[PDB]
Amino acid sequence: NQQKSLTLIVALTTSYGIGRSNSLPWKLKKEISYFKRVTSFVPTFDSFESMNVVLMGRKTWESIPLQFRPLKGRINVVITRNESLDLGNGIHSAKSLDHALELLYRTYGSESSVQINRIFVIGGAQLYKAAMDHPKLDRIMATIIYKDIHCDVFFPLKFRDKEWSSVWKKEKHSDLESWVGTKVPHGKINEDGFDYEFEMWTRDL
């Protein structure tokens, strides 16, 4: 069930809004290419053997443009109690976060030609709530959108605010680039009228 740390990845407004109408309220081309880059990166040496894992809630799974599904070059797991009849040509299903981690550890042992590198939780709000409570979650890759966009779904813990500042710390940009293994734009990007910026936050386990 245990081993590796969990990483959460999220794009949020300064008001912690994360979606509206079971979609993103924004169309941000470069934000999705960042997403793709970060969740896909494995060191070159390790590249033959290893892949990353993306964990998501069922409604997020349903939200991804059918075209984009499943997430290429990543082991995809959908968390669902109502697993009943998942539909996937080797996309896994699991009844909880910890059940997912036991599944991967069983499926991808030292037998397996495929080994796991990093595990990411990619949403939605319900799964984020479970991962924020999980004793192995230590890192948050956030994209901050500097607009009060109308949302109906909110991130569950205000990790950037004063009350959490002795636990969650923002890392220097050079530490961001090192962890994701590529240059990343420092400061604000403007696309389709939205200003936004890339951050990395960590906590001690």
Residue positions in the annotated binding site? Answer: 11, 17-23, 31-36, 58-60, 74, 80-82, 123-130
The strand ranges marked E within 158-193 are 169-170, 189-191
Q: Which CB sits closer to ligand NDP, 51 or 153? A: 153
Q: Dihedral angle at the C-alpha atoms of 127, 131, 134, 139, nearest 10 degrees?
A: 170
Nearer to ligand NDP, 83 or 115 (CB): 83
In angstroms, the CA 144 to CA 162 distance is 17
**Near ligand NDP by CB under 6 A, which window of 54-62, 104-112, 156-164, 178-186?**
54-62
Q: Residues 24, 64, 103, 184: which binds ligand NDP (CB under 6 A)? A: 24
115 sits near ligand NDP (criterion: CB under 6 A): no
> Minimum CB separation from ligand NDP for residue 28, in Å?
10
d(CA 31, CA 97): 26
Of 181, 133, 152, nearest to 8 (Cα)? 133
68 binds, among ligand TOP, ligand NDP, none (CB under 5 to 8 A by kind): ligand TOP
Residues binding ligand TOP (CB under 6 A): 9-11, 24, 31-32, 35, 60, 63-65, 68, 122-123, 143
Alpha-carbon gap, residue 101 to 91, rounded angstroms: 14
Measure the CA–CA gap between 24 and 13, rounded to whole angstroms. Answer: 11
Residue among 31 and 100 whose Cβ is closer to ligand TOP? 31
